[PDB]
Amino acid sequence: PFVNKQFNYKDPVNGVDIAYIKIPNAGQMQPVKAFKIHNKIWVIPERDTFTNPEEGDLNPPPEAKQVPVSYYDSTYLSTDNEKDNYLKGVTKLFERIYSTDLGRMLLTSIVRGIPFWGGSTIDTELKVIDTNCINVIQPDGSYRSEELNLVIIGPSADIIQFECKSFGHEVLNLTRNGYGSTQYIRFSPDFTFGFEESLEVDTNPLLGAGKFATDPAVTLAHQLIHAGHRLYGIAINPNRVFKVNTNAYYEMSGLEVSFEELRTFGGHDAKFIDSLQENEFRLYYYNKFKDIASTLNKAKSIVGTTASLQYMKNVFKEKYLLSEDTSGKFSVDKLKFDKLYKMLTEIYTEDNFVKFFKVLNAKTFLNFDKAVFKINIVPKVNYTIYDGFNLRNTNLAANFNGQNTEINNMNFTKLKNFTGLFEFYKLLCVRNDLCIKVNNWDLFFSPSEDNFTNDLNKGEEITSDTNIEAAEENISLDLIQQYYLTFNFDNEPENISIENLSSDIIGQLELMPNIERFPNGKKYELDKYTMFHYLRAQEFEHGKSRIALTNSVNEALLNPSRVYTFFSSDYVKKVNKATEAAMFLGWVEQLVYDFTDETSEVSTTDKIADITIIIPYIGPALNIGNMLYKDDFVGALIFSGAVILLEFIPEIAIPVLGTFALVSYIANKVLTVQTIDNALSKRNEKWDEVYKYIVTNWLAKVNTQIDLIRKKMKEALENQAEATKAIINYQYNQYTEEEKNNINFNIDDLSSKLNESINKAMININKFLNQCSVSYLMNSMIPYGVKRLEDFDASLKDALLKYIYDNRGTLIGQVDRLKDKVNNTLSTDIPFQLSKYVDNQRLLSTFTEYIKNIINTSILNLRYESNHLIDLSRYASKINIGSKVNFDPIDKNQIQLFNLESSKIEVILKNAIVYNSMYENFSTSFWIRIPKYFNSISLNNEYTIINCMENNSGWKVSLNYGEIIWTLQDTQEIKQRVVFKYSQMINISDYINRWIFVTITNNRLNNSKIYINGRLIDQKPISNLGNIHASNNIMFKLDGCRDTHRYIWIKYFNLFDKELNEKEIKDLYDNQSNSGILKDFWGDYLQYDKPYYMLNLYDPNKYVDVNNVGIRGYMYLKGPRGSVMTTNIYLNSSLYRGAKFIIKKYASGNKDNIVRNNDRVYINVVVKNKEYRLATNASQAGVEKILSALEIPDVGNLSQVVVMKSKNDQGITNKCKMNLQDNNGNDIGFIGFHQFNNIAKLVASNWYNRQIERSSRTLGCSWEFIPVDDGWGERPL
Ligand SMILES: [Zn+2]
């Protein structure tokens, strides 16, 4: 820390702060020269050759160590100069670390570390473990033992194998027992690791060129964070490793991250460790301290120094944050411990440092380094304490340029990795065997299910004084700030003179686990091609090959010029074809554009709330489609969901949650009323544990994969840009030889381009990915955990209601409110807040948008997507569709079901995901389309359309002559039904043969409501209905319809696991109305070329009629619209009356024949088997324009274009649908009628236009198109 005096290697040894140290090693050891950069921190610029006897050889091994990166240089740090530079650097980084709040604290804990005085010399005595000191050679040839705390030596063989090294004890785990011991950090500030980014792009649009460098400070900071743990004897056993599955072509051959490694990194990595294991350690170390206190508390004497036993007892007092009374006895204050621990453990972590140092760095410990670099930090021009590489001013600070080894090329010297490229690998063969050498450190992680401990099954007794939950302070910079303030920076252990130790302190390193070499080669003969294969097929041989030509098909990895793409053929074309230099730059522009073009493709799939943004080429870039129902990734993903991306499917074991036992109290109100609260509280907490748990499982099994892909793609895209830089290159590589011609093709600029083109591409791919992650979590992992909670919840309620009962008379004046409190709480879940377990601004932000759409909420949501009737909410397991089930050809999401027992759709919901307390509070909505009841059979015949019962298992939608019903019924067969009844004796109905939005709400504690088209039609209490079954499957089929020709049309069936409120209902309702599409009088999308009868909503009793064809003729509303009936059944004004209307395309055609909100169209009036053209003369007289049915060829420049409408300019629905316009583009007006001497000719008046703005009064322009419909048995006269 800080380091007071600037050293130089040659500076004369002086017994202190610069001496000839004799580290505690084994056997003899010529003293080594080390400096004291600070109280308790020495620096030996030698290669760690001493610490380990079996490590004196600094030469590389004929066999490579299974590590992604390695580097050797027997000669490194040999010269006396190198030492000095090493000295200069190790320091500068301490200064770097030290110049940060976080840094500052850590170095104070490290210096304060001080290995406990074990040396167990007689219980009661205190003593120094000589292995924690060093002998310091004084000038006069003497030597005085000195206590040490942390030492920095040079790297051993493998230069970049930085690590913490401590000497062990004969019988003590000085690193895992609380004692702590002097640490020897093998570190070098002359080499770094290069890594690649593929996220920051979101914030940094112009992110660096390629591989970035890792600020040495972080690395050092990472290593100290380790010395910290060890100094405080809190290091996790290195026998604790996150097991990894290896057998699989996609799995990582070998890799064993330690918990203490995942711990030290922090970020999410640290979240891989389940809560149960987390607290396992805590208590473990919390007890190590308790013994420290004990050890101290009974220490009478102290052999060794001339420092007061009190002094000593105090150092360790101030170290471990012990608390002592007046007698001087020590104790471990749990609450105070949790803090110290929390600090050494979660505040001080690599990720947290990456915040203080504002540098770019790996965002996970599982992001394997791909390089080594020779850096030189000493010169300020290179690296500064404050800015590092990203120097102020310098063009390095805009986008971690200083860290970009390519941009800041001058500061990074690409060295030779010593792990080839296929050292550790896997052999992947397709089905010409067709295999590929896939790099080990290039395969998938894949945590072993073992790792995820749990313990969620243990039930629990809930006394009255149980201890309630605790936050999950995500260690925000704010919390750090707090810690900083409350941080104690003054006073640092004195250099307590200890009595000389052995001239040769006997060492012996703590024993690290053995490096289990891992198998290599391992062959994999597979079926389908792999993402690895595809990726492979996009690299192509360096360059000395023949001008490679892009070419689809995986066989694109058989030719020496093996290259493949996921781009549109045309690109292939443009690229694969000679281009005369006369015309070259054009080409460049072309490709670039086309690149940046193809590369930015994003599907909106708005009609799919869940995963909005979509990058289609992903499927064919990584062959992600996983081969399903043949191609169409964007359709593939939709049919399955983000699952189609996982190289492997993670499971979620969420045991049958235990239960709370309730300790009862005899005639003790308080104590009782307090237990119920503790019960409920712990339950709340109970939900948190589960959520937090699946987030850990989601964080390592799922999210990790998605991230690999995230890289993979980024890899892909580059593989492409790299070739299009090859090809294009080859061309100009055979240039005309004419200088001055073109400001150079600037390959180092076309690249600057292709860079951006890809950088943005990733911005899209990333969003897309983030969605598949969050989303996958929400519909494939949470549901499971929830089920169990909801179960638990369902149980606890009883257990609680009972408790209350069993204790009434003691809960005298409260046996109701408590009964209400328990019933009120345990009647709704505990929302899953992702922010409670994740800081990730990326994912949370995502999670937020996902939550906004109430649809992603639904436990069942089935639309007709792509080519299937699927349950986008991923709850259904098998959606069996009948054979007599028809799907409207237009909007196939409109299902029609007949009376035939063969037309039916049954949906079964994944059992594991289905809890029986599922239908207490829940809503259901769907759009209905009921034909008209013509017969009388229909009367008093209630057929059922939607049924979900398991022997009296409530709710099943039924129909009966002019009414829709919803009946709830419990096992105790008590049933309650709410009904919406619609008369069939109306001129014009709002429900007959039309589409009706229906939503049914259910609140166990309240009533069952039925909403028709948004408004509440009726409600009936249900606070009396007993328990209800949770039917595993729902059946869509009419049942008991005596009518033979009865059928219905359902649409947008959804099922919500909560009581949708009015607002929600109305929102949901407006959303499923496709306001951008005009409608049938019955609700279908209006359509082009499809004769409709006009029904004027203002004067429903009339009907359009063409007085006389021609401009000298007119159209008007004719007399009395006939009636229709069938005594005792219906008496509706007739519809299929008057002249038909035919909408003709005019703007954007050939496309679907659906008429959309703002289409310019043509209205052909069909007069006497002939079709004319409704037009007018915008040059008439008044505002009104009479309109006539002209002869299509005689129309000419007359006003005929009608702008169809659906949403008022303001945005409000309006019936006024036809706005006529003059060719000049003007606005002649909406079409309506108008009295002209008691004739009311159809007219296009600009009046409505005006009114439609103001009010929303049904106006004379309130038209309605009526096609003939099998639902309206009426016969078109
Ligand atoms: Zn580490």
GROMACS .gro file of N, CA and C and ligand atoms in nm, residues 222-223 226 261, ligand 1:
model
   13
  222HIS      N    1  -0.683  -0.930  -0.776
  222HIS     CA    2  -0.745  -1.058  -0.766
  222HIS      C    3  -0.665  -1.146  -0.675
  223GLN      N    4  -0.535  -1.140  -0.688
  223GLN     CA    5  -0.445  -1.220  -0.609
  223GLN      C    6  -0.437  -1.178  -0.464
  226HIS      N    7  -0.704  -1.280  -0.258
  226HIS     CA    8  -0.679  -1.415  -0.216
  226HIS      C    9  -0.594  -1.419  -0.095
  261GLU      N   10  -1.251  -1.960  -0.591
  261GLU     CA   11  -1.213  -1.893  -0.711
  261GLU      C   12  -1.333  -1.823  -0.763
 1278ZN      ZN   13  -0.758  -1.658  -0.832
   0.00000   0.00000   0.00000
